[PDB]
Structure formats: structure tokens, C-alpha cells
Design an enzyme around this catalytic site. Structure first.
Site, short mmCIF file in Angstrom:
data_model
loop_
_atom_site.label_atom_id
_atom_site.label_comp_id
_atom_site.label_asym_id
_atom_site.label_seq_id
_atom_site.Cartn_x
_atom_site.Cartn_y
_atom_site.Cartn_z
N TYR A 73 0.86 -1.20 0.00
CA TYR A 73 0.00 0.00 0.00
C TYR A 73 0.88 1.24 0.00
O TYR A 73 2.12 1.13 0.09
CB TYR A 73 -0.87 0.03 1.27
CG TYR A 73 -2.05 1.01 1.24
CD1 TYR A 73 -3.03 0.92 0.25
CD2 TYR A 73 -2.18 2.01 2.23
CE1 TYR A 73 -4.13 1.80 0.23
CE2 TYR A 73 -3.28 2.89 2.23
CZ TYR A 73 -4.23 2.77 1.23
OH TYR A 73 -5.30 3.62 1.20
N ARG A 98 -6.71 2.38 3.51
CA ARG A 98 -7.44 1.14 3.50
C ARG A 98 -6.54 -0.01 3.92
O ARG A 98 -6.95 -1.16 3.96
CB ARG A 98 -7.99 0.88 2.11
CG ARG A 98 -8.87 1.98 1.57
CD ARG A 98 -9.08 1.78 0.08
NE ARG A 98 -10.25 2.49 -0.45
CZ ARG A 98 -11.51 2.18 -0.16
NH1 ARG A 98 -11.80 1.19 0.70
NH2 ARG A 98 -12.49 2.88 -0.74
N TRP A 124 -10.81 10.93 -2.85
CA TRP A 124 -9.46 10.89 -2.29
C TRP A 124 -8.37 11.28 -3.28
O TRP A 124 -7.40 11.94 -2.91
CB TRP A 124 -9.16 9.48 -1.77
CG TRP A 124 -10.05 8.98 -0.67
CD1 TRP A 124 -10.99 7.99 -0.76
CD2 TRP A 124 -10.03 9.39 0.68
NE1 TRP A 124 -11.58 7.78 0.47
CE2 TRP A 124 -11.02 8.64 1.36
CE3 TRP A 124 -9.29 10.34 1.39
CZ2 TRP A 124 -11.27 8.82 2.74
CZ3 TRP A 124 -9.56 10.51 2.74
CH2 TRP A 124 -10.54 9.76 3.39
C1 LIG Z 1 -9.14 3.86 7.23
O1 LIG Z 1 -10.26 4.69 6.97
C2 LIG Z 1 -10.44 4.63 5.59
C3 LIG Z 1 -11.41 3.82 5.06
C4 LIG Z 1 -11.57 3.78 3.69
C5 LIG Z 1 -10.75 4.53 2.89
C6 LIG Z 1 -9.76 5.35 3.43
C7 LIG Z 1 -8.85 6.08 2.58
C8 LIG Z 1 -8.98 5.94 1.21
C9 LIG Z 1 -8.09 6.59 0.37
C10 LIG Z 1 -7.12 7.33 0.99
C11 LIG Z 1 -6.15 8.07 0.18
O2 LIG Z 1 -5.82 9.17 0.62
N1 LIG Z 1 -5.78 7.39 -0.97
C12 LIG Z 1 -4.86 7.99 -1.90
C13 LIG Z 1 -5.49 8.67 -3.09
C14 LIG Z 1 -4.39 9.42 -3.83
N2 LIG Z 1 -3.48 8.39 -4.31
C15 LIG Z 1 -2.57 8.95 -5.26
C16 LIG Z 1 -2.09 7.87 -6.21
F1 LIG Z 1 -3.06 6.96 -6.57
F2 LIG Z 1 -1.68 8.52 -7.31
F3 LIG Z 1 -1.03 7.14 -5.72
C17 LIG Z 1 -2.76 7.86 -3.16
C18 LIG Z 1 -3.78 7.05 -2.38
C19 LIG Z 1 -7.04 7.43 2.37
N3 LIG Z 1 -7.88 6.80 3.20
C20 LIG Z 1 -9.62 5.39 4.79
N1 LIG Z 2 -12.66 -1.32 -2.53
C1 LIG Z 2 -11.23 -1.18 -2.72
C2 LIG Z 2 -10.73 0.23 -3.06
C3 LIG Z 2 -9.26 0.09 -3.48
C4 LIG Z 2 -8.61 1.28 -4.16
O1 LIG Z 2 -9.20 1.75 -5.35
N2 LIG Z 2 -7.47 1.77 -3.61
C5 LIG Z 2 -6.81 2.97 -4.12
C6 LIG Z 2 -5.91 3.59 -3.04
S1 LIG Z 2 -6.81 4.21 -1.60
C7 LIG Z 2 -5.96 2.82 -5.36
O2 LIG Z 2 -5.27 1.62 -5.67
N3 LIG Z 2 -5.86 3.91 -6.13
C8 LIG Z 2 -4.67 4.21 -6.90
C9 LIG Z 2 -4.98 3.77 -8.31
O3 LIG Z 2 -6.06 4.05 -8.81
O4 LIG Z 2 -4.18 3.13 -9.00
C10 LIG Z 2 -10.58 -1.76 -1.50
O5 LIG Z 2 -11.30 -1.95 -0.51
O6 LIG Z 2 -9.36 -2.08 -1.46
#
Ligand SMILES: COc1cccc(-c2ccc(C(=O)NC3CCN(CC(F)(F)F)CC3)cn2)c1
Ligand SMILES: N[C@@H](CCC(=O)N[C@@H](CS)C(=O)NCC(=O)O)C(=O)O
Ligand SMILES: [Mg+2]
Lengths: 198, 198
Positions: free
Chosen positions: A7, A13, A103
Site C-alpha cells: 500500500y 485502506r 481521495w
Molecule cells: C481507514 O479509513 C479509511 C477507510 C476507507 C478509505 C480510506 C482512505 C482511502 C483513500 C485514501 C487516500 O488518501 N488514498 C490515496 C489517493 C491518492 N493516491 C494517489 C495515487 F493513486 F496517485 F497514488 C494515493 C492514495 C485514504 N484513506 C480510509
Molecule cells: N474497494 C477497494 C478500493 C481500493 C482502491 O481503489 N485503492 C486505491 C488507493 S486508496 C488505489 O489503488 N488507487 C490508486 C490507483 O487508482 O491506481 C478496497 O477496498 O481495497
């Protein structure tokens, strides 16, 4: 039995997986990637999304499916098929809201506007529904802690970053938050983990 | 047990449960509603969202959490923890994409645009991933049909209304739908079930 969690450098997540591990005392490697290493890995994964868990050269995806796997026949699971349901339902109701946030939006104002809406319009209602569902019981599901109790405290953590007055009218939620956090193996991970906004 | 499932007259979120009930051959009260008596109902609900399932006045929510609960200790569940972790993963990945549609959006054109662009850019990205996750294998997970194949045909059924050519380059994904549909209990249900657009 070999554990590599992949991650970004964030609770996000993955934190539901990292609470589980450190609770259920299992050695894992906590693989945290840079936003710029990502595409190179995104390409190679069946579903292009993280978290993912490698379990001896085997690749798992979807945090809750994983979370649900690390707790099948363990004391964070529901003590019964009905309590497994309520757990999954509780979790999904929180994921359903958490999953609403834009996000990854790179347009900041557009993003802020959307975060603010949800945090004022949808949040307190979720908190409401939760408090009542809790009513007066000590845990969310049944008579002991479960990972749903963890999801809650984790989701609540990040929401609190963006809107601090959130649980003001829900001491029974701050109580539950705090009672999850004071668990030996949970408490200690909270002390050691990387210190990330998110 | 005595089961009463409550939802609208449509497929949508309840369908995964109906399929499971038919496959498992479980007598159940299939209560559908028109809006007419909705906020009249919505009030009496912990989380004010449907579908919901009453199992002897004990009420349960979250369509996937329920469907899972209903597949617990059958073969629909996946045959191994590991598989069950995969079955869950696919069901979420599927549900994740579905929750991205503005379902109740009443500006018909914003609907059209997003819908069509979600099928344009998002949907075919998920198709190759599903296609290539499936491979030339029989079912998505394991040696036998699991409730993740059920969800695929339910989801793909609904998205195929909006873009018929959606799967015109994934022979194998049309293959999987047909194998789901020809299952006797499902094929019985299919022809029986009432006629609704979604
Ligand atoms: C733990 O509480 C939760 C539950 C569900 C989701 C989240 C959560 C989801 C996404 C992010 C988050 O900030 N994800 C980012 C989105 C931007 N990307 C940029 C990327 F994809 F370019 F790498 C990095 C991951 C943080 N918390 C937190
Ligand atoms: N329902 C999925 C959501 C997963 C997800 O889309 N994660 C994001 C990061 S928070 C991700 O890989 N985004 C970067 C991308 O789109 O490549 C889970 O529970 O894992
Ligand atoms: Mg979900």
C-alpha cells in the site's frame, strides 16, 4: 506462512489490515510505496488497485475481503453467523461512506468542496445512525471486540483529521473509539506506526 | 428460519440475494415496494437504506453482507478461506464499480454523459481485468460456481442495458454469464422473476 502487505505510506485502506496483524500478533512486512513507484506496480497487478496481500507467492486484493480472511475463525470475528453479518454490514456502511470521498482528485478546490459537503451533509447522519445502533452496548457487535470495532475506530480517526467537532454529540462514540485504542496490541501499534496525515 | 427480504420492484441490490435464495432453494418472502410507502418504512430502519432482510424480526442490512451470510457453509461461499477471500474481493471490485454510477441522478443528460463515459473509460478497464482474471477457466474462483459469478452476471446484466456492445470483445465474459444463467435454479428464477428495467 509469509506476509508482504502492499500500500502507500498511509493508514488508508491498509490500516484495517495493520490493526488486525499487530492485534493477532503475526509478523508481517509493511511495504509502503512512493506515489512515484506506483504505476510500475499498478501495471503488474490483476486489478490495478491496492492494498494487496502476498501470502507465499499468492496475491490477494480488496482490503475487506482480506480483513475478512485474517479474521475467519478468530475472536475479532462474530461469535455467530448472524454477528458475522452485522460485522460485515457495519464495515460496509462505513466503507460505503469512506468510499464516497474523492481521495484521488488532483484538482484541490474541486476536491475540498466535495470533502466539505460530505463532512457536513452526510457525516453527522452516519454518526447518528451509529450511536443509535450502538445504543448502550459495549461493542458494536455482540459481547466482545471485533474488527468492525477496528474499522470504526480507524474510519473515525481519518474523519477527525478533517472535522474535529464530529463526535462532540456522541460521547458513546468517543468512548468506543477510545476503548478500541486502549487494547494492549492495538494501543501499542498506535504508538509505533508511521505518523501519516492519512 | 423465516426470511423476509425488503426492496423495490427491480433487480439492483436485492438480486444477489434472490439468486442465492433460488440456488440454495430457500423459501423466503420477497417483498417489493413502490416509493408510496418508503419514508413510512425508512423510519423503522437502523440505517435507513435498503435492501434489508428480516430473519424472524431480527433485521439485517447491507446487501452483500446479507448475501454472504446466506452463502455461509454452502459451496457458493468458495471452497477454502483463500477462495472465499477471492470471492469477496471480486464481489467488492464489482460493487465498487457499480457504486460509481449516479443511480438517482435526475438530470438525464449528466446521467447519460457519466454513464456513457464510465462505460467508455472505466468499464472497459475492468472488463480486461475480469476477462484476464477469469482466463479460459470455467468460473471466476475455484472449480465450481461461487456467488462472485452470480454477481458478475447480475452486474453485467444491468450494465448491458446501457451499452450492449460492452462485452463484444470479451467472448469469455459472455461465456461466464451464460454458464450462470443456465444453472437450473437460476434459469428457473430468471424466467419467473418479474419484468423490470433494472
Ligand atoms: C481507514 O479509513 C479509511 C477507510 C476507507 C478509505 C480510506 C482512505 C482511502 C483513500 C485514501 C487516500 O488518501 N488514498 C490515496 C489517493 C491518492 N493516491 C494517489 C495515487 F493513486 F496517485 F497514488 C494515493 C492514495 C485514504 N484513506 C480510509
Ligand atoms: N474497494 C477497494 C478500493 C481500493 C482502491 O481503489 N485503492 C486505491 C488507493 S486508496 C488505489 O489503488 N488507487 C490508486 C490507483 O487508482 O491506481 C478496497 O477496498 O481495497
Ligand atoms: Mg463495498
Amino acid at each position: 506462512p509469509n506476509y508482504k502487505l502492499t500500500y502507500f505510506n498511509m493508514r488508508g485502506r491498509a490500516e484495517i489490515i495493520r490493526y488486525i496483524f499487530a492485534y493477532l500478533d503475526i509478523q508481517y512486512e509493511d511495504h509502503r510505496i512512493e506515489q512515484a513507484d506506483w504505476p510500475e506496480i499498478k501495471s503488474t497487478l490483476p486489478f490495478g488497485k491496492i492494498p494487496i496481500l502476498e501470502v507465499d507467492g499468492l496475491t490477494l486484493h480488496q482490503s475487506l475481503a482480506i480483513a475478512r480472511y485474517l479474521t475467519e475463525n478468530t475472536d475479532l470475528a462474530g461469535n455467530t453467523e448472524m454477528e458475522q453479518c452485522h460485522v460485515d454490514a457495519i464495515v460496509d456502511t462505513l466503507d460505503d461512506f469512506m468510499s464516497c470521498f474523492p481521495w484521488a482528485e488532483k484538482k484541490q478546490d474541486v476536491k475540498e468542496q466535495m470533502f466539505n459537503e460530505l463532512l457536513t451533509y452526510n457525516a453527522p447522519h452516519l454518526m447518528q445512525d451509529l450511536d443509535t445502533y450502538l445504543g448502550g452496548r459495549e461493542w458494536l457487535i455482540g459481547n466482545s471486540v471485533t474488527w468492525a470495532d477496528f474499522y470504526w475506530e480507524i474510519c473515525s480517526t481519518t474523519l477527525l483529521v478533517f472535522k474535529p467537532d464530529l463526535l462532540d454529540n456522541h460521547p458513546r462514540l468517543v468512548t468506543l473509539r477510545k476503548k478500541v485504542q486502549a487494547i494492549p496490541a492495538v494501543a501499542n501499534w498506535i504508538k509505533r506506526r508511521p505518523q501519516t496525515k492519512l
